[PDB]
Amino acid sequence: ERDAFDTLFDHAPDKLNVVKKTLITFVNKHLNKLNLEVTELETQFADGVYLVLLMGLLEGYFVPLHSFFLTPDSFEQKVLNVSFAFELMQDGGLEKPKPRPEDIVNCDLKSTLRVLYNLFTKYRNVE
């Protein structure tokens, strides 16, 4: 099974470009609160750190930095971080994400963008 996000990612370069553009703006609206900048969606979410921090910010709090692997030393620590971000998503009411947590760690762009897009849809009005 595929959906409209598969269709644009797979077939619509111009629409994909505004999606990416919008996602970079959105993730920085929040991550800039921590003096963090994203420039490259392809890799800067792979280690799970920004994704955890973003999830706290979208729900109005700062996640304790010792509660996840702030400087992950391995594939496994990255996967654990992504899994924790997915847990926070579900705790807040989102359906379990489509992608495996390791898909994000392995820098699958479509997986990364879908996850971020579903956050944007839900949380675009968080200040």
Author numbering: 246 to 372
Paper text:
The adaptor protein paxillin contains five conserved leucine-rich (LD) motifs that interact with a variety of focal adhesion proteins, such as α-parvin. It belongs to the highly conserved parvin family that shares a common architecture composed of a variable N-terminal region followed by two CH domains (Olski et al., 2001). Our results demonstrate that full-length α-parvin contains a single LD binding site, formed by the N-linker helix, helix A, and helix G of the C-terminal type-5 CH domain.
However, limited proteolysis led to the identification of a stable fragment, α-parvin-CHC, that readily crystallized. This fragment includes residues 242–372 and thereby spans the entire C-terminal CH domain as defined by SMART (Schultz et al., 1998) and a portion of the inter-CH domain linker. The crystal structure of α-parvin-CHC at 1.05 Å resolution was determined by molecular replacement using an ensemble of homologous type-1 CH domain structures as search model. The refined structural model includes α-parvin residues 246–372 (molecule A) or 247–372 (molecule B) and represents the first high-resolution crystal structure of a type-5 CH domain. In spite of very low levels of sequence conservation (≤26% identity) compared to canonical type-1 CH domains, α-parvin-CHC exhibits a typical CH domain core composed of four main α-helices (αA, αC, αE, and αG; nomenclature from Djinovic Carugo et al., 1997), which are connected by loops and shorter helical elements (αD and αF). Atypically, however, the N-terminal boundary of α-parvin-CHC is extended by a short α-helix comprising residues 249 to 256. We therefore conclude that the N-linker helix forms an integral part of the type-5 CH domain of α-parvin, which is in agreement with its resistance to proteolysis. Another feature peculiar to this type-5 CH domain is the loop between helices C and E, which contains a 3 (or 4)-residue insertion (relative to type-1 CH domains) that is conserved throughout the parvin family. Interestingly, the crystal structure of α−parvin-CHC presented here shows that part of the putative ABS2 region is obstructed by the N-linker helix.
